[PDB]
Amino acid sequence: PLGSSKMSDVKCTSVVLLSVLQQLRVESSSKLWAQCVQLHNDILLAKDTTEAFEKMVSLLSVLLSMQGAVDINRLCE
């Protein structure tokens, strides 16, 4: 009832994504955290798969900024 297989995957991925951000104690920055929740919320209510992916790009960018090459690098293993 969430949508296609691809849409279900995106929505579920955004949930895990938000959890990782929280796990990285990003909640501290209340301004930034609010924007993350909003992105995450727009992905879950999305009807079109293209709006979901665009929002996921914005949300994932927060994680990449905080993690840094070194971490996501030895992480892609």
Partner: protein, 155 residues
């Protein structure tokens, strides 16, 4: 029953209220002044498991835009603000070396997240403006890397 498995060994009535009492007190004695801090070792393992789960999922999605920003992140090129989706929206990025700059920039156009961006300004490690003409293979060793590129999303 199973009211015995635990409350068995020798028996009567309040010969049970006694046992539950001791256990409660023995647990209190043990918990009065016990470690309050968190085990950093485990917290690290949890983070790792969650990230592994996340990237496995991102890989599975196999979306060009997500893949692009992930790979650029692996090269040290990372976003400093949330990537915008509306026209003319501002985006700021760190470019660590020339190899990464030439792989993403062509003239005054920056290719990122399956989109095009117009470069408005470039500043080096010293926060000084760098002219696009200054950024080329031969002159790169003279630049104070890394660079912060600012661009506006194309139509």
């Amino acid at each position: 029953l199973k009211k015995s498995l635990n409350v068995a060994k020798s028996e009567f009535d309040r010969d049970a209220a006694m046992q539950r009492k001791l256990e409660k007190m023995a647990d209190q004695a043990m918990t009065q002044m016990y470690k309050q801090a968190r085990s950093e070792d485990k917290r690290a393992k949890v983070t790792s498991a969650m990230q592994t789960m996340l990237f496995t999922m991102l890989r599975k999605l196999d979306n060009d835009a997500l893949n692009n920003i992930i790979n650029n992140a692996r090269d040290g090129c990372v976003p400093l603000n949330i990537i915008p989706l509306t026209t003319a929206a501002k985006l700021m990025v760190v470019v660590p070396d020339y190899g990464t700059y030439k792989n993403t920039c062509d003239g005054n156009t920056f290719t990122y997240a399956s989109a095009l961006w117009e470069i408005q300004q470039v500043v080096d490690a010293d926060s000084k403006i760098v002219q696009l003409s200054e950024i080329n293979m031969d002159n790169s060793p003279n630049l104070a890397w890394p660079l912060i590129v600012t661009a506006l999303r194309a139509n």
